Amino acid sequence: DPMVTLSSILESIINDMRDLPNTYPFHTPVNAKVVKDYYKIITRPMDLQTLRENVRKRLYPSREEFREHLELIVKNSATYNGPKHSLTQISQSMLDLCDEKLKEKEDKLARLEKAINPLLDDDDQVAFSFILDNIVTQKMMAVPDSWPFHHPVNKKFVPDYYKVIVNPMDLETIRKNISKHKYQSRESFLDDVNLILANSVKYNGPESQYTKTAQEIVNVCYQTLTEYDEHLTQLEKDICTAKEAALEE
Numbered sequence: 001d002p003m004v005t006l007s008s009i010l011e012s013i014i015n016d017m018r019d020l021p022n023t024y025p026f027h028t029p030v031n032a033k034v035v036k037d038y039y040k041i042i043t044r045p046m047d048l049q050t051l052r053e054n055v056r057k058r059l060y061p062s063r064e065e066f067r068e069h070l071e072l073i074v075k076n077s078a079t080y081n082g083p084k085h086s087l088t089q090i091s092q093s094m095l096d097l098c099d100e101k102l103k104e105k106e107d108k109l110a111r112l113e114k115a116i117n118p119l120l121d122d123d124d125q126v127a128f129s130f131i132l133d134n135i136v137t138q139k140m141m142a143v144p145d146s147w148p149f150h151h152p153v154n155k156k157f158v159p160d161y162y163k164v165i166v167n168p169m170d171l172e173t174i175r176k177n178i179s180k181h182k183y184q185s186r187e188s189f190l191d192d193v194n195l196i197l198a199n200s201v202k203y204n205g206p207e208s209q210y211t212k213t214a215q216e217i218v219n220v221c222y223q224t225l226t227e228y229d230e231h232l233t234q235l236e237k238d239i240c241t242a243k244e245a246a247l248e249e
C-alpha cells in the first residue's frame with residue numbers, strides 16, 4: 001500500500017526532527033492549562049506527536065499536506081514566542097531538516113504520491129491547476145488593496161476574527177489547495193473564492209471598503225474564468241475521464 005510506505009518515510013523524518021537539539025518543547029501539544037492564553041493567540045495548534053499520530057491516521061497523502069502541518073509549528077512559535085525567539089529558531093531547524101529529507105527522497109516520494117492519487121500525474125489536472133494559480137496571482141492578488149485577503153488572518157492581531165468567521169478562507173489557502181490539486185472543476189474553486197467575499201460581508205459589513213475589494217476579487221475571477229471557458233471546459237471533461245479511469249483501476 002503506497003500510503004503505508006509514504007507514512008513510514010514521513011515518520012522517519014519526524015524521528016530525525018525529534019532528534020535535533022532543544023526540540024523537546026515541540027514534541028507534544030502545548031499545555032493550555034499552563035499557557036493559559038495560548039488558544040486566544042493560536043488558531044491551529046500543532047506539535048510532533050500530533051503530526052506523528054496524523055501520519056499514522058493516514059491523513060497525509062503527499063509531502064505537501066505533511067509539510068503544511070509541520071510549518072504550523074514554526075508559524076505558531078513565531079506568533080506566540082516571536083520571530084527571532086530561540087524556540088522559533090529551533091522549530092525552523094526542524095522544518096529545514098524536513099526540507100533536506102524531502103529533497104533527498106523527492107523521486108521516491110513523487111512515485112508514491114502518484115500511486116496514491118493518479119491525478120497528480122494527469123497532464124490535464126496539472127494544466128487546470130496552473131491556470132487557476134495564474135488567475136489567483138496575476139488577476140486576483142493584483143486587485144488594488146487586496147492585502148487583507150492574501151493570507152489567513154492572524155488572531156494575534158485580530159483577536160475576535162475566528163469567533164465571527166468560523167469558515168475562513170484566503171488567497172494563500174486557495175493557492176495551497178491548487179498546489180495539492182484540490183480543484184477538479186471551477187465550481188469547487190468558486191466555492192472557496194466566494195467564501196472570501198462572504199467572510200468579508202459577515203465580518204466587515206456589506207458596504208465596507210474591505211467588502212468592495214473582495215467583490216472586485218470575485219468579479220475579476222469570474223471575468224477571467226469566462227475568458228478561458230472553452231479551455232477550462234475541455235480540461236474539466238478530461239479530468240473527469242482520468243478520475244473515472246483511476247477509480248476503475
Ligand SMILES: C[C@@H]1COCCN1c1cc(C2([S@](C)(=N)=O)CC2)nc(-c2cccc3cnccc23)n1
Nearest residue numbers: 147148149150151152153154157158200203204210
Ligand atoms: C480583519 C481585516 C478585515 O477583514 C478582512 C481581513 N482583515 C485583515 C487581514 C489581515 C491579514 S494578517 C496580517 N495575516 O492578519 C493579512 C491577512 N490583517 C489585518 C490587520 C492586521 C493587523 C492590524 C490591522 C489593523 N487595521 C486593519 C487590519 C489589520 N486585517
